[PDB]
Amino acid sequence: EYLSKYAIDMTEQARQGKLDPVIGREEEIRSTIRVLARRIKSNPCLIGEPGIGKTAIIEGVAQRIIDDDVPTILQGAKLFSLDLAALTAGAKYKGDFEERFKGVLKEIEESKTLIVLFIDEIHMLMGNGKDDAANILKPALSRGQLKVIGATTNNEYRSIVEKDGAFERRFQKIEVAEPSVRQTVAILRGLQPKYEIHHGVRILDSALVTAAQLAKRYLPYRRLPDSALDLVDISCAGVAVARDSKQNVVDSDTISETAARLTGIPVKKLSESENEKLIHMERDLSSEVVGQMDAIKAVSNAVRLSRSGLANPRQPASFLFLGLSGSGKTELAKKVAGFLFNDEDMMIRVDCSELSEKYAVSKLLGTTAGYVGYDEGGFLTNQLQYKPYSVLLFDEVEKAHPDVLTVMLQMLDDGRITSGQGKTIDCSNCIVIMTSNLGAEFINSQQGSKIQESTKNLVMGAVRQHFRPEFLNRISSIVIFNKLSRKAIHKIVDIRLKEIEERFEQNDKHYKLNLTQEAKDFLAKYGYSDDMGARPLNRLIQNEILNKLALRILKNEIKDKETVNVVLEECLEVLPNHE
Amino acid sequence: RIIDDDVPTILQGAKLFSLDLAALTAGAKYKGDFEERFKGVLKEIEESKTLIVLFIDEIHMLMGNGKDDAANILKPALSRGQLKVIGATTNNEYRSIVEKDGAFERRFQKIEVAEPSVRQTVAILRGLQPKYEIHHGVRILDSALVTAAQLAKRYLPYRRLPDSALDLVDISCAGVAVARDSKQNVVDSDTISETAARLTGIPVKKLSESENEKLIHMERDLSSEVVGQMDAIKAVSNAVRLSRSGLANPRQPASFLFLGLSGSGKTELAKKVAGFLFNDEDMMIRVDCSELSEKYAVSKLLGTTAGYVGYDEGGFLTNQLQYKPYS
Numbered sequence: 001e002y003l004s005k006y007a008i009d010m011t012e013q014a015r016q017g018k019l020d021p022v023i024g025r026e027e028e029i030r031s032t033i034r035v036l037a038r039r040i041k042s043n044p045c046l047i048g049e050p051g052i053g054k055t056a057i058i059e060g061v062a063q064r065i066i067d068d069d070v071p072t073i074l075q076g077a078k079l080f081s082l083d084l085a086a087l088t089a090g091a092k093y094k095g096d097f098e099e100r101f102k103g104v105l106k107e108i109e110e111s112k113t114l115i116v117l118f119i120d121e122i123h124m125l126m127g128n129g130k131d132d133a134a135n136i137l138k139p140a141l142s143r144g145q146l147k148v149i150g151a152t153t154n155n156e157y158r159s160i161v162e163k164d165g166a167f168e169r170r171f172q173k174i175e176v177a178e179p180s181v182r183q184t185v186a187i188l189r190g191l192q193p194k195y196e197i198h199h200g201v202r203i204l205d206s207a208l209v210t211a212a213q214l215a216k217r218y219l220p221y222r223r224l225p226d227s228a229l230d231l232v233d234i235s236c237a238g239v240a241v242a243r244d245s246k247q248n249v250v251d252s253d254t255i256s257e258t259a260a261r262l263t264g265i266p267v268k269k270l271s272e273s274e275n276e277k278l279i280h281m282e283r284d285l286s287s288e289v290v291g292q293m294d295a296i297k298a299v300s301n302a303v304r305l306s307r308s309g310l311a312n313p314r315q316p317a318s319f320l321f322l323g324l325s326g327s328g329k330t331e332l333a334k335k336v337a338g339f340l341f342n343d344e345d346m347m348i349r350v351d352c353s354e355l356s357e358k359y360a361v362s363k364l365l366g367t368t369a370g371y372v373g374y375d376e377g378g379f380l381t382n383q384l385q386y387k388p389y390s391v392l393l394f395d396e397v398e399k400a401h402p403d404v405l406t407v408m409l410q411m412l413d414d415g416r417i418t419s420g421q422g423k424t425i426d427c428s429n430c431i432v433i434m435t436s437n438l439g440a441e442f443i444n445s446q447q448g449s450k451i452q453e454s455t456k457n458l459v460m461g462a463v464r465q466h467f468r469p470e471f472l473n474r475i476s477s478i479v480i481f482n483k484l485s486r487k488a489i490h491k492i493v494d495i496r497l498k499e500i501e502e503r504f505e506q507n508d509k510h511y512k513l514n515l516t517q518e519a520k521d522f523l524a525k526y527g528y529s530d531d532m533g534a535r536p537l538n539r540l541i542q543n544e545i546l547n548k549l550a551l552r553i554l555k556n557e558i559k560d561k562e563t564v565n566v567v568l569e570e571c572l573e574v575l576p577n578h579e
Numbered sequence: 580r581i582i583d584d585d586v587p588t589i590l591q592g593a594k595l596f597s598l599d600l601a602a603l604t605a606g607a608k609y610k611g612d613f614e615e616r617f618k619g620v621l622k623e624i625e626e627s628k629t630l631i632v633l634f635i636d637e638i639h640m641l642m643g644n645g646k647d648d649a650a651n652i653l654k655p656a657l658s659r660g661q662l663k664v665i666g667a668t669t670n671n672e673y674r675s676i677v678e679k680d681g682a683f684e685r686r687f688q689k690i691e692v693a694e695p696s697v698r699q700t701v702a703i704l705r706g707l708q709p710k711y712e713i714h715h716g717v718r719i720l721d722s723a724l725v726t727a728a729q730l731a732k733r734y735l736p737y738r739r740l741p742d743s744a745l746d747l748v749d750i751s752c753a754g755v756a757v758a759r760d761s762k763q764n765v766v767d768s769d770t771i772s773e774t775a776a777r778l779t780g781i782p783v784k785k786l787s788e789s790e791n792e793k794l795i796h797m798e799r800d801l802s803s804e805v806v807g808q809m810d811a812i813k814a815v816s817n818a819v820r821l822s823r824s825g826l827a828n829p830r831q832p833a834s835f836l837f838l839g840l841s842g843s844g845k846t847e848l849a850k851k852v853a854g855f856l857f858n859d860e861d862m863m864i865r866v867d868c869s870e871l872s873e874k875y876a877v878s879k880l881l882g883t884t885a886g887y888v889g890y891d892e893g894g895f896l897t898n899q900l901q902y903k904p905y906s
């Protein structure tokens with residue numbers, strides 16, 4: 001009985017129970033059975049992607065077999081899971097494993113009721129150059145009963161039959177696929193007592209639902225049975241630790257924290273501190289963003305939609321930041337990331353001046369099949385696979401070549417971002433920002449520092465001249481970055497010096513910062529041009545103030561309360577010591 | 580446990596015998612003598628004088644070399660009559676037993692036997708401590724036993740603890756007696772740490788008397804020959820310094836990546852390091868990374884599995900590291 005030395009008697013296990021319940025797979029089972037009930041080519045296959053119930057089906061049919069819920073032909077049949085050592089026990093001496101394979105088929109073929117094999121991984125037999133290379137040992141007898149149910153993913157399947165050509169003329173593919181979200185829940189429910197027993201915890205029914213929905217909207221690279229079950233099992237393990245520490249899987253908190261840990265995506269965590277969350281961010285940003293509350297609100301609005309689920313699952317929120325050059329809109333994208341992730345450097349960004357029709361799409365998403373370089377994902381999906389929710393930033397997107405600009409439509413809506421190798425990324429809870437200086441021409445009208453009605457349409461005009469309407473009409477919001485003028489820049493300067501103090505290495509020296517009109521004007525006069533915007537306010541602060549005082553610090557001429565003043569372009573700040 | 584009566588009386592009344600080998604090889608000429616040799620054993624085993632349990636320490640040496648009905652058939656054939664047999668086999672051998680016979684899997688109860696932890700190992704060593712002290716006429720420090728088990732776990736990965744720890748104890752005890760009785764006790768450090776190093780290599784466990792003539796001179800001499808790159812020399816010397824006494828992480832090789840202008844000594848330093856470490860530059864294991872393809876790149880270093888043209892695995896790494904632990 002060679003079979004008993006290599007295979008697992010699934011029937012015996014089923015006879016003894018020790019199997020999971022099988023949920024919703026009745027039709028895959030019916031099809032499997034129907035093929036097995038055939039006169040000749042009774043060789044069905046369970047085919048799809050990993051983690052979709054392919055072996056569940058077998059436990060299922062094993063149970064149907066035990067209970068005679070099968071056709072006459074199968075009523076008394078038995079089933080064995082083989083593979084494994086059948087191909088490797090014969091580690092030495094030519095023809096040894098071949099003899100086993102044959103002996104097994106002989107054992108199966110003769111007399112002993114109807115025996116059905118289950119091949120878990122038919123691709124492992126493959127037919128490695130045929131010429132007696134394992135899989136090739138079968139075909140001679142595929143008509144001679146020796147019924148067998150196979151299993152393989154579509155990639156594996158396609159590889160086998162393309163290279164072989166006979167198996168696809170001998171076997172009956174049965175599509176096996178992930179369940180709907182509700183069906184997934186039913187599955188999770190069926191396995192619920194298994195996990196509850198092994199971990200000693202309860203699972204809320206709503207946790208099963210959350211895991212099913214979450215998996216569908218969280219893990220694009222894992223099929224629902226495994227994906228949702230892992231969310232359940234991983235969560236159960238976490239709960240078991242809590243149980244042991246001194247419980248159940250909490251739909252909201254166990255699963256959300258587990259998910260937050262596993263991947264991130266702020267939306268899946270959603271903090272309960274509503275009094276401040278999604279409120280305070282505008283104030284935090286206001287300090288960074290002086291005057292331009294309009295941009296803050298535009299962003300904050302999208303952030304608020306993603307939280308609590310108002311945002312559309314397939315529409316990553318996205319903005320186009322138009323405006324006065326030097327407006328500070330890039331830092332805004334980082335400061336938003338600051339709030340969103342408690343990480344200003346979470347983002348992925350692309351320098352769009354590097355883009356050309358000759359290569360840009362591949363620089364962004366990676367090259368395709370047969371071409372040099374497999375840096376799949378290029379600048380972008382290469383990184384999305386690690387941080388699906390990171391903020392995306394397109395520096396000077398206005399300079400991006402129009403073809404790659406068009407590819408970026410995927411970020412804006414119908415979020416099926418793909419990779420050059422024919423793979424799918426899928427973005428949802430991912431805020432995307434693109435930048436342009438087109439609004440500068442209208443902001444520079446100076447008709448109030450705030451861009452006004454009508455003039456903002458002139459901006460849209462400039463935008464239509466550079467961006468296709470196909471892009472523009474799909475942006476969550478197009479935001480215009482206004483003139484800061486003297487009032488904002490006086491505040492920006494006071495603020496920049498403050499914010500620098502807080503981050504100026506250590507608070508050992510401290511500042512007075514009494515700029516007085518002299519230094520406020522220096523920074524606001526020889527700095528903030530409308531076309532340089534705030535860029536020079538920071539540069540003068542660093543080039544003249546932080547630098548000269550730093551040099552005095554290095555000489556140990558400064559001990560306490562540093563001040564700022566000017567010579568009176570010769571002003572150049574030029575600050576005294578503070579020893 | 581039987582003579583001490585820690586065994587159910589059902590079994591306690593039994594006698595235990597170590598069999599095989601001569602049991603078969605005593606005969607030769609005369610076909611069937613082999614069966615005649617197993618046959619009266621397999622009768623006397625139950626003939627009034629209690630039940631005798633046979634011990635086949637190496638079950639895997641039964642079954643038959645090409646089967647040949649080499650009296651192995653007597654076992655299954657008679658196995659219904661108790662005739663209890665206890666045996667043993669290596670994990671690897673068990674696989675062979677099962678595949679070769681089948682019936683043995685059905686007749687025997689497989690039992691996994693665990694490797695002890697260092698803590699458990701030391702307890703074992705303590706039990707045997709007096710045997711070695713008596714056998715050699717030397718004493719053993721308790722910390723020495725701890726050291727042997729702990730040290731072995733870290734520096735004898737090819738040998739399981741029940742043996743590795745004892746090898747260090749027995750070898751060390753002999754080292755003490757041997758030196759003594761040439762033309763005392765086993766010291767955790769001065770005897771075992773040093774003994775293991777003499778056996779396995781690992782200079783850091785020699786607990787050398789001088790980090791001047793091992794580290795200091797290293798920086799000087801590497802600097803004497805390699806001019807400039809002082810930064811690198813110190814980086815290596817310091818990384819090496821951390822391995823002293825085993826302070827460095829038990830799972831991480833000293834490791835460097837040398838970047839820089841060609842002609843700056845990126846490999847010359849490495850040779851000089853070997854020049855210091857083994858007192859010989861040629862003891863460095865050069866890995867020809869210049870020739871790599873993902874389809875050969877690993878295999879030439881680590882070799883391949885059975886069934887592939889040529890086994891002689893390990894071209895550059897396995898074949899050297901198995902013999903040179905601190906290369």
Ligand SMILES: Nc1ncnc2c1ncn2[C@@H]1O[C@H](COP(=O)(O)OP(=O)(O)OP(O)(O)=S)[C@@H](O)[C@H]1O
Pocket residue numbers: 020021022023049050051052053054055056059120187190191225226229
């Ligand atoms: N009704 C079910 N019965 C048993 N297992 C289930 C069931 N539903 C989901 N599963 C999970 O799926 C696993 C086995 O089912 P599959 O999705 O076929 O996994 P698989 O991909 O067949 O396994 P391989 O060997 O990688 S194909 C189990 O270990 C469970 O975690």
Ligand SMILES: Nc1ncnc2c1ncn2[C@@H]1O[C@H](COP(=O)(O)OP(=O)(O)OP(O)(O)=S)[C@@H](O)[C@H]1O
Pocket residue numbers: 288289290291292324325326327328329330331332396435437481484492496533534535538
């Ligand atoms: N309205 C604003 N929004 C954001 N940051 C601002 C604003 N006004 C001033 N800043 C400050 O200006 C600096 C950020 O400037 P950057 O974003 O590098 O310049 P930029 O205008 O983004 O350059 P671009 O976007 O390529 S034209 C920070 O120090 C901000 O605190």
Ligand SMILES: Nc1ncnc2c1ncn2[C@@H]1O[C@H](COP(=O)(O)OP(=O)(O)OP(O)(O)=S)[C@@H](O)[C@H]1O
Pocket residue numbers: 804805806807808840841842843844845846847848
């Ligand atoms: N700092 C140095 N002091 C003394 N001799 C040196 C020094 N650097 C290099 N040399 C000599 O020049 C060669 C340096 O050899 P290598 O270290 O291989 O050069 P390299 O940079 O390794 O070459 P590659 O291609 O990067 S391996 C040796 O043959 C030494 O004789």
